[PDB]
Amino acid sequence: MNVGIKGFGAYAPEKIIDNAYFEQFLDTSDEWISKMTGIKERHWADDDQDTSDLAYEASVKAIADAGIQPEDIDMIIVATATGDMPFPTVANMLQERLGTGKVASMDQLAACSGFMYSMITAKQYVQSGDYHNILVVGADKLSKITDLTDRSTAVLFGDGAGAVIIGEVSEGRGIISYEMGSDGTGGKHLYLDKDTGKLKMNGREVFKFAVRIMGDASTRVVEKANLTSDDIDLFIPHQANIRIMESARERLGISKDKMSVSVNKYGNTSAASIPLSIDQELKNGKLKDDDTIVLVGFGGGLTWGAMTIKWG
Amino acid sequence: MNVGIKGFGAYAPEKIIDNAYFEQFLDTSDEWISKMTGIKERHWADDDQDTSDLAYEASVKAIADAGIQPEDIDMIIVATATGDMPFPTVANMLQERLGTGKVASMDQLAACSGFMYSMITAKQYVQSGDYHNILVVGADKLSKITDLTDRSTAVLFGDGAGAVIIGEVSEGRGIISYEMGSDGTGGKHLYLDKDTGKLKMNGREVFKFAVRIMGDASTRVVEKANLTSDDIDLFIPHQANIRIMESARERLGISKDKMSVSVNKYGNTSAASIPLSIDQELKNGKLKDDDTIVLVGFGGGLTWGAMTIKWG
């Protein structure tokens, strides 16, 4: 069987925040932020728009793109680290808002690597032959856990969502190979502070891990796919920092005209970052049926994931 | 392929809370609590003992019982609605604490149905042929989210953890049939208040829903397994309420001795509920190799999950 993406959709909220905005209360500048992260703007959800709302906009587009009805969905999986509540989950809320049947729904937590973990999980279910159209979403409203007084993190995160329908795809297409991992010793380097409720990060430690793991993991899934860098049409890494992405790109061997870059317009959106990037490449005519791409991400945990996909 | 439980272990914390304890802060009596819930005592975790610690205790027991080494685990999945933090997850924390490889590790959220969802998830992975020893944990420290000013919920919840190693078992044994579902229109009846951090419940509505689904989902998996009520040695429901459980027992027309009951000693421990009950039946000599049992959980979301397993 060939399991792949039957439909795709992504969404970013209305309010756009440019770099200049942070100078009103932080010791920063457009130049500094651009130079250190590659970010120029980022999108923040309105105060009445939560993670579930972002997830729902991405999900309706992915369903429409798959050409199926909400009744065709047989499972909903949501990768998020910022769900509205622990229960009901964002997945539970989509079940009702999308009007699907009373199908299994659950959220999965693996931070920025969440979308990858969830697509792979969906693959397993579809593979069993018992599921045919699984809605997988990667959504996060990071503005909810950002500490605005911390210049290091305040300018990094944005809000957004991406969604796909995982199911059987035509011959040769789909998820070819994949890799998932975690390393809890790095937990103290990126975590949600218990009584502050804000993201705390050891930037240098996360930077070092990101660059090595994203390059290593990418190389492994390309080989397990029996391919080489030259066969990859698009390299789509978690969009956390343009300097991390560039290092990982080198360590991979792929040319820059082949790496998707969207961190400049969205900042870091955790689980939604790879899908938002995919959306741009689709809209700018850079990703086509039968193109071969490599998705790779890292995240708090620490966690990582990577996969090779034959598009269409 | 026959996939089942290769190892099992459970854990409840030291501090035992009797019914008489609440009279000092609420309008309660042991008679009232006993009649409304069936609970006599429940266990609460120490202030420096979080959900991950409860999960670690259950996990070491399951690994020993499976006869494997930590290095043998190739995936960790923790079902919880009270994880220490959204990232790193309890699963990430176990990866480090248990000393396993840098395996994929994630938390799944489906409230009190989480353990069932997670075991079924692990099954898909073992069935793909790529994983052989998956640690699934059901853990919760509800004492963290209980509103102590609300007599109706303050007296129902306890803390605990359960764990199993999912992998291949001998012919005929293991997970025979299953089902999972959800209905988000029931979200308002049981949820975590986003602003207060405490559990909110509409007892009447949850009672109605729980009785109906516990009975309905149980029937459905017994039939899917081509068995009948009589072929079932033990019925192990989520221990949410003795009234709910009996009402669902009477509906099943089954003997008191065919239903495991531990809510009297643990209260409602959400995702740990079923494993702590199984632990009791093993310890008391009521569950032995080749017995065929039915597990069925239901909870916030709303969600539910059920399965039939031939033990061993």
From Swiss-Prot, chains A, B:
GO terms for cellular component: cytoplasm. Disulfide bonds: none annotated. Keywords: Acyltransferase, Cytoplasm, Fatty acid biosynthesis, Fatty acid metabolism, Lipid biosynthesis, Lipid metabolism, Multifunctional enzyme, Transferase. One of its GO terms (biological process) is fatty acid biosynthetic process. It catalyses: malonyl-[ACP] + acetyl-CoA + H(+) = 3-oxobutanoyl-[ACP] + CO2 + CoA. Pathway: Lipid metabolism; fatty acid biosynthesis. Its EC number is 2.3.1.180. It is found in: Cytoplasm. Residues 239-243 are annotated as: ACP-binding. The active site is at C112, H238, N268. One of its GO terms (molecular function) is 3-oxoacyl-[acyl-carrier-protein] synthase activity. Catalyzes the condensation reaction of fatty acid synthesis by the addition to an acyl acceptor of two carbons from malonyl-ACP. Catalyzes the first condensation reaction which initiates fatty acid synthesis and may therefore play a role in governing the total rate of fatty acid production. Possesses both acetoacetyl-ACP synthase and acetyl transacylase activities. Its substrate specificity determines the biosynthesis of branched-chain and/or straight-chain of fatty acids. The last Arg residue of the ACP-binding site is essential for the weak association between ACP/AcpP and FabH. Homodimer. NCBIfam families: fabH, PRK09352.1. Belongs to the thiolase-like superfamily. FabH family. This is Beta-ketoacyl-[acyl-carrier-protein] synthase III.
